A paper describes a structure:
As exemplified by isoniazid, which targets the enoylreductase in mycolic acid biosynthesis, mycocerosic acid synthase (MAS) offers a potential drug target by producing part of phthiocerol dimycocerosate (PDIM), a key component of the cell envelope. MAS, a fully reducing iterative type I polyketide synthase (PKS), is composed of six domains that together catalyze the elongation of n-C6-C20 fatty acids to prepare mycocerosic acid. Using a combination of dual covalent crosslinking and cryo-EM analyses, we elucidate the structure of mycocerosic acid synthase from Mycobacterium tuberculosis trapped in two distinct catalytic states during its iterative cycle. These structures reveal domain architecture of the acyl carrier protein mediating condensation and dehydration through dual site-selective crosslinking of the acyl carrier protein with the ketosynthase and dehydratase domains.
We also obtained a density map for complex B from the same dataset with a higher overall resolution (3.22 Å) that further elucidates details of the condensation compartment (KS-LD-AT), with only one ACP crosslinked at KS. Complex B revealed the homodimeric condensation compartment (KS-LD-AT) with one ACP crosslinked at KS via 1, while the other KS was inhibited by 1 in small molecule form (without ACP). Covalent bond S-C between the KS active site Cys177 and the reactive α-position of the crosslinker, as well as the O-P covalent bond between the ACP active residue Ser2060 and the PPant arm, were determined by continuous map density. Interactions between ACP and KS are limited to a single hydrogen bond between Arg2045 on loop 1 of the ACP and Glu79 of KS along with weak hydrophobic and electrostatic interactions. Complex B reveals that the docking of ACP on KS is mainly facilitated by interactions with the neighboring AT domain via hydrogen bonding between Arg2032 and Arg2033 on helix 1 and Arg2090 on helix 4 with Asp819 on the AT domain. In MAS complex B, the crosslinker, tethered through a phosphodiester linkage to Ser2060 of ACP, has the PPant arm forming hydrogen bonds with residues Thr279 and Thr281 in KS. The warhead carbonyl of crosslinker 1 coordinates with two highly conserved residues His312 and His348, trapping the transacylation (substrate loading or reloading) state of KS in its gate-closed form. Supported by continuous map density, the C16 acyl tail of 1 is buried deep within the hydrophobic tunnel formed by the KS • KS’ dimeric interface. In terms of substrate chain length, it is noteworthy that the two substrate tunnels formed by the KS • KS’ dimer in complex B are connected, contributing to a potential substrate tunnel sharing to accommodate C22-C28 mycocerosic acids products. In complex B, MAS potentially adopts KS gating loops similar to E. coli type II KSs, and the presence of key gating residues is essential for activity.
Residue numbers in the entry:
A (entry chain A): 3 to 880
B (entry chain B): 1 to 881
C (entry chain C): 2011 to 2106
Write the structure that this text describes.
Amino acid sequence: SRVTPVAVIGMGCRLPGGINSPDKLWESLLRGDDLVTEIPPDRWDADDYYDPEPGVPGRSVSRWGGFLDDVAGFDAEFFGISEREATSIDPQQRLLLETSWEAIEHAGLDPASLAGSSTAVFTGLTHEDYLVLTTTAGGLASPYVVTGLNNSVASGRIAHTLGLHGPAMTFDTACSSGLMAVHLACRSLHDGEADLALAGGCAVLLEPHASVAASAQGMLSSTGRCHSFDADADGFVRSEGCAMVLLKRLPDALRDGNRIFAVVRGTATNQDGRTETLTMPSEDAQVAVYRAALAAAGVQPETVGVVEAHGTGTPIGDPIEYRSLARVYGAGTPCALGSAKSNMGHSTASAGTVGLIKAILSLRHGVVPPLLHFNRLPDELSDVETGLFVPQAVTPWPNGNDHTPKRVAVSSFGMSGTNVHAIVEEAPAEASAPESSPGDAEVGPRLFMLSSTSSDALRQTARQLATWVEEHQDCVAASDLAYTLARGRAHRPVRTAVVAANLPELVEGLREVADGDALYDAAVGHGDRGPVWVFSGQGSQWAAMGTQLLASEPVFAATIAKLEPVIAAESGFSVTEAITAQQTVTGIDKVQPAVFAVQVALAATMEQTYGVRPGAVVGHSMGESAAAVVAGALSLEDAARVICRRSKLMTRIAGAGAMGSVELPAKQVNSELMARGIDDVVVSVVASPQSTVIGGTSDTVRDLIARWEQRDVMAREVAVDVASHSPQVDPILDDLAAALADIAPMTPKVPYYSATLFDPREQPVCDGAYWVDNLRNTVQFAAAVQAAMEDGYRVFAELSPHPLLTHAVEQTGRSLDMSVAALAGMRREQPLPHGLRGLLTELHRAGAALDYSALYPAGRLVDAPLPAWTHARLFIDD
Amino acid sequence: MESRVTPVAVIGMGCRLPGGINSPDKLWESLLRGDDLVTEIPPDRWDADDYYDPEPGVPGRSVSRWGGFLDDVAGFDAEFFGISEREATSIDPQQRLLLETSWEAIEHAGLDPASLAGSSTAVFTGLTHEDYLVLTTTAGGLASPYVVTGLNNSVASGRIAHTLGLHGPAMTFDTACSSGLMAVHLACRSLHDGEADLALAGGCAVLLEPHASVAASAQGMLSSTGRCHSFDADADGFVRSEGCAMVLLKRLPDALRDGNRIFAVVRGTATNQDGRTETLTMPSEDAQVAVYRAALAAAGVQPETVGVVEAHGTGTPIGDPIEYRSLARVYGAGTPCALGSAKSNMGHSTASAGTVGLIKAILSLRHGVVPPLLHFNRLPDELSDVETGLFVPQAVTPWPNGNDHTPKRVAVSSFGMSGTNVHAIVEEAPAEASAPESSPGDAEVGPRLFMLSSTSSDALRQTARQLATWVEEHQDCVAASDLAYTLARGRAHRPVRTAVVAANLPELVEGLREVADGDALYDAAVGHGDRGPVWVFSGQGSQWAAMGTQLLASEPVFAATIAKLEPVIAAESGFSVTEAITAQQTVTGIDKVQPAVFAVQVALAATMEQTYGVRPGAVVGHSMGESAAAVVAGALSLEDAARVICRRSKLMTRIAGAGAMGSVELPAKQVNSELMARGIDDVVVSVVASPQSTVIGGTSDTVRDLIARWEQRDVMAREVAVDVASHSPQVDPILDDLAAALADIAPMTPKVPYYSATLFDPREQPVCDGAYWVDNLRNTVQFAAAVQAAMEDGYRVFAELSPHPLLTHAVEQTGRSLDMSVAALAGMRREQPLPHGLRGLLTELHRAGAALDYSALYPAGRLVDAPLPAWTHARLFIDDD
Amino acid sequence: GPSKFRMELLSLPQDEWAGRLRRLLVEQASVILRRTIDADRSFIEYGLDSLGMLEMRTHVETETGIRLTPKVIATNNTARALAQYLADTLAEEQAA
Ligand SMILES: *[C@@H](CCCCCCCCCCCCCC)C(=O)NCCNC(=O)CCNC(=O)[C@H](O)C(C)(C)COP(=O)(O)O
Ligand SMILES: *[C@@H](CCCCCCCCCCCCCC)C(=O)NCCNC(=O)CCNC(=O)[C@H](O)C(C)(C)COP(*)(=O)O
């Protein structure tokens, strides 16, 4: 072997007829589809130039071509491109930018993970149609033309966008540009200049003057069809198309476990040299490049089963090529001769890569697609004795032996006389992991995860995937598909999840998402920071809260089982019946422990079963006790005593005061309270900057409420037993401190934003005096939440039985002009047949950091379709 | 110590830059003189006032009115490359300049581009901008069929490979302003692989249209002042400028083995991308530092041994401080290091400044000095904190840290707009492993032959004038013999060619001025150099008094051959050859006239082959001329043909005035019909000289009476009195004696092809026996058919080797009949002096285009930097007036 | 004299100076980018190129009298940070 083998670990393409995926390309090739259509009126009026008489000046003989369903579409915002600059960008560059992202995602890699890598980019561009259209419109004066119409930035932008550091050059080698990029990338990876390579080309047809000019040369087909290797060959038809591949050194790819589609064992390039005419090919030059590539790959030509020829369909090009192949390949052993350009026309720049992609697919499925538009070879090739043949149907691999890996030969010959050839071998024998036992493939709901750049794109994405799952539901494994959508895709800003146990169930859910009218909204996080647990106070209790979770989640049930004896120890009460009875838990000695048990088990389930690391913890009222447990400051055996011992204490002062809710800032409330000479009523909880909770003497509290109602102020009393965070609790703190004298606080390991300490940023020591202070002092919950946002957290999920502070969090975030998400872990009478997977679905939708490895330990990548795009039409105009 | 790539030697460089710079040496003179090459935009391109606006950011207007412009962009030598005028009109000028400069690069390396046919030479050409495409679509000329190759970028490199018949990889590419040096990266990589043994790298810049300036001006790139104030505190942007530059690259072990001249060694090169950093065009400091240490690692060079950095130096207020701070982090670690940038002198030659920067680096290496930076007055205050050994030279500076233990090394950098950086480390050429310098040898100062060439007459005069100026300057820096060697075996001989004979350079300067000013019409060569000339050997009538006196005194080998043949005639004819050729009166009497003509003519052909290496591709003789032709082609030995001719002249000396030669313009068929009408057999066709000229031999009275018959009928039937009526029945009685008296010779097979007028078919090999000779004095001389078969074989150059040309006019006539352009040179003329021996024939033989053995004429010598020939540029452009 | 916004802003207590600025920025970037921005996600991934940075540079100069430079927006890569950078810069010059 002359060079290092290079593995094609990812492929991406956009091709005429709506083909935008390598798997979709294979289906069309196998079906024998013909993607050559009449020129859409959107490009130009074909009848303004069509003339069947050859060589008529100013007129073309071709009215056909292979066109993309749309070209002006480009998801500009997802790449941070403003419409003003996006409009002037050559569509060839935009399609390359999009398809390169598809190529990386197809490999199972997050493109954002490639930032800072030594990845190299090689893109070939041969047509300046958008430049000419801009010149005709006279819009060259726009400053964005400097970047929009230059050819170097076609690969520069891709490297700039993804933050790559390898070579990022753009070349132009005519119709062999697509395959030349693979040869250059295979060279660069071997030299060590890079560790990953993006190779391919793009061609876009927007102007008739390119077609008529070639028509005057007699190049294009009169019948408008690339009759490759047929007697009626009369020329080619230009066609749009963009295709890219991702290349990585084989030892690295095998070491890192990336899926390998095929191995490029060696490439070679050559020039036709001096010929009769500048565009005439040379037979001996083609024969030389064949032996050069085989020598570089170190493989005998007798073992190359299938040759993917150039096959443009020119009357003189094919006989030269056919003689070239017969002198090297097909030496006795049968050989199959194919050409992708028959099915979709000549893609020019990208024709090299598309031919390669067809070769990759043929290797994987082990068959050769029939060659469209073939009846017989030209009569002048009758005497050539060779093993070559043109398949007229889906044929098995011509060799059929097992001792030798399947190999193909890919060729591409440029107009300027530059030839490219590459030898591709099938992927290595899969390093199959130990077979998954039926116990590992547990029957149970799994999250299938979607993403897109907009609401409509998500609905389109769901529809596409639903049809794909409906086809491969027997061939694909549900475990792998769940793994692939989570661990092997890029989570685009607008995202959702569908939970199901079987693929048919998954399809039905996707169709509901496809036809649903819900306004899916973009995520607010970046997966860099974990969610912030919010532990609310009392009042969220509802009848039979824990019945569903106990019957569904084992860790939740286990947590209650461990904590139940402590309640029966300190308070002598059984929480299992209270949270499962038909009546809401009542009594402070019962209400507080019941809420505490649910919250801590909810947190316990989340970071153990679903492995969600909390980025920060925020506590409100007794929720601070739950907050301490999750933060690692205390053990559950301590806070349970803290809750239980405290809970029985204010049973003495049940009814010792009344609470009021004032929807005004606390600062002005304090000033008005001071100006009124009143000092028994104090601010209890600063819930939001626009709301305040007060408590004190029951009759007096009603008096300011009436004194606020006469001022038409929105105010309300709070129907709860104990005047917490007010001087009414005074007769207990001395007893409470003695009861908590045995508490052993520890330093918190999770960021703790206490609402009791004057500075929320302080990491508390949850000693006895804290809870004494917590009950007496006011709660600056809005301040603590505000502090967490200032630190950068944006996702808050409250773990109470019912949402009570989610509205407060949203108000505080809005008061800071900050985009935040307020999720609810549980809701009153909300059925959750799938357990807490609903919250996990919501947390991912918001964008909190997750340990997807814990949810999806291992699995094989599969071919799930990539997400759609928010294709806004961005084209020049006159 | 570790070198991960093979060192690559730059064996040839060529460029075309603004201000009439057409050669690397002329670039060096400009840099030392501190020339500023940017000018106001010429009205020929566009009206600059139609777009100028000093206010930055104004829509639809450009802030700069200056640029560096080539003196002639539309100029192209279409016919030399075999491209029709129509096709060349629609070819992008970037492609046309690349084709011309690449040819200049190959010649500058000392190689004939025709010798690269079938080689594995690779071609990488950087190329940005599409101004001609913009112009073409504005004029609406895209319907032309030639556009498919004229405007497609891939043909830019494909055309070079197609023209020269190169088989290595050939591609063009775009990497913004770093494409020029990126070509060197790919070429070094391709050579390292073994894919190629020669590589052309470079780029082209062309500035035909204004909107490119307007679009960039809105972005704020364009400099308001109009000069690239590289590394100056007043930097405000760059200025675009035209320019093309190409280099030729070869593996260093191969360059040493073949003995090619090395200008510099590219030890290593590397490239990378800036990555995600602010805006698309904002450069990254850390990326620049990475490529420096990567290139050094690949080249195995520590940075402290690099003394000069050819920085990118665009002149933007953002780019320059990033460059300086990045360089100070790598280079100049305590040791002084000199900064520089070719951008300052000639603006930004986008997509080619990478190569132009490289070329400046090589010239600095060979001359060992750092050119001053033009507009530098003070570094920006932002860089006052940076501590470094770097410094910007304000005058011609000796090489920093100059020493012999460490070879001089240069770092070349070039950064593109897309963010792709290229950086290469260049070392001086290895210590000259030349032959003993000024060693004794061919120290003779005899007049040497200096060769000129071009594509047209007016081009030759321009070429002579340019070379005359160059020789006038370097008359002391180089030896005359080396210049003669360079022009002969180190250049490509274009169709229009001539030579000048001189003994010393001062005479040469006078000679070129005569050629540059003379109104001589220099016709292009008719030969392709494939086949050697065809010697022509004549009959009687060429003799004149004291012919060889000057030749005997000017060609020692001629004299040796004359002396060699002297004894045999002194035995067979009894008289010394020097008598007839040195007497003050013309030799008379066939017994001495005939041997004398044969003796000189044989030595003449001997003089060409032994002394001037002129191997004849074919040989043709006439009458007596077959004897001389037989010796030269190898059909018979030298002395044996001598006894052959003296015996004949003596044997027919028995008769005087045996008959007559009626020479008529009538065709042989027509005179045969006329003779049949006359019915006499006393006269016979003796010589078929031309299709429009026939010679009739026979009895005197039958000739004289009958030739008057055409003279009454107004027919061009002249005759000059001759001693012998050969090829006629008048010599028949002596043939029996002649058939045996000279039968002692032993003919053998010629080693050279022979066309014989004696045989019916000249192409047949003639056995030079007496019977064949007896045919010669009797059979009709079929000379016209003899030369006809020669040109049917494609031979083109015919030289008449006779004291006076007699049959040359016949060659032109038959060539005119054949509609086939041929050369009819004459070896020597009547009374014509020979101040330089037969060198006057050789210069004409070269001008005709025959095959020559230049190795024999020019055994050895070092190549020189003599200026390349000027092109016949024609104004080819697209107009929308 | 200075823009009407600058008179109002200084007359207001300095603690909301970030809040009022954080809007002069959101509105101005919204019209420049033609997209309702958010106050925390970075400009560069909105597509704020070098030109748009100039339009921001000149506009804030008219509205606040502060000479912004393109490196600063490159450093204060988000609106909240940029408004924060404007706040103390206003505070520092005021204290002079
Ligand atoms: C790719 C060809 C790419 C170039 C032509 C299509 C694009 C539009 C024109 C270029 C841009 C113009 C400027 C902007 C508007 C390709 O695959 N081509 C065919 C490859 N075949 C091949 O090389 C051999 C085919 N050649 C011939 O059949 C033969 O040379 C001709 C019939 C074409 C010419 O014959 P003659 O004129 O007698 O030499
Ligand atoms: C050369 C840069 C490219 C010059 C030629 C561009 C001509 C237009 C090409 C497209 C065709 C349009 C016409 C179609 C008919 C170069 O040498 N690049 C390296 C240095 N160049 C830089 O830009 C580096 C310094 N950059 C800057 O100063 C800033 O990024 C600029 C001023 C560009 C933007 O400032 P803003 O980001 O603060």
